[PDB]
Amino acid sequence: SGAIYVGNYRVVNRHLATHNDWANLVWEDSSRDLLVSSTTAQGCDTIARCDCQTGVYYCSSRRKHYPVSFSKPSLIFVEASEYYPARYQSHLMLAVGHSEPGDCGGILRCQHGVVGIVSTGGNGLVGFADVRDLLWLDE
Ligand SMILES: NC(=O)[C@H]1CCCN(C(=O)Cc2cccnc2N)C1
Ligand SMILES: [Zn+2]
């Protein structure tokens, strides 16, 4: 679990969005595993606007943060799960690191701010849904 709180927006993994997230829907994209909902309170976070390929993510299944090198956002095949059929997930960045289901929502940050959230994993890999291209989050 986990979310990004920026301005009057909450960014979560689409597959973990609550009834309240869907009742206050701003934008969602199944191909990216992202959903953004509106909030009444002003959020705690800054979004990175950069091309960093290194940063640090929070791994809830270890209660720890780990440094990672990650690929540029791209279209990557993701196996079928209970939440989606087998498909290509876009804007996804992979890195070598620990992740379990439950780790989705952990933030990846670089020195400029929030880069994205954990969205996929397994086999010693961790995948992050990129948010740096969503310029409207702080416009
Ligand atoms: N389609 C998606 O974005 C995900 C939906 C939930 C299930 N998916 C995983 O990759 C979970 C996972 C498996 C094993 C270790 N770590 C993990 N985070 C795919
Ligand atoms: Zn950066």
UniProtKB/Swiss-Prot annotation:
Residue ranges that the Swiss-Prot or TrEMBL entry lists as coiled coil: none
Protein function: Cysteine protease that cleaves viral polyprotein and specific host proteins. It is responsible for the autocatalytic cleavage between the P1 and P2 regions, which is the first cleavage occurring in the polyprotein. Also cleaves the host translation initiation factor EIF4G1, in order to shut down the capped cellular mRNA translation. Inhibits the host nucleus-cytoplasm protein and RNA trafficking by cleaving host members of the nuclear pores. Counteracts stress granule formation probably by antagonizing its assembly or promoting its dissassembly.
Entry protein name: Protease 2A
Binding residue positions for Zn(2+) 1: C50, C52, C110, H112
Subunit structure: Homodimer.
Superkingdom of origin: Viruses
Source organism of the structure: Coxsackievirus A16 (strain G-10)
Active site: H15 (for protease 2a activity), D33 (for protease 2a activity), C104 (for protease 2a activity)
Catalytically driven reaction(s): Selective cleavage of Tyr-|-Gly bond in the picornavirus polyprotein
Residues of the full protein shown: 869 to 1007 of 2193
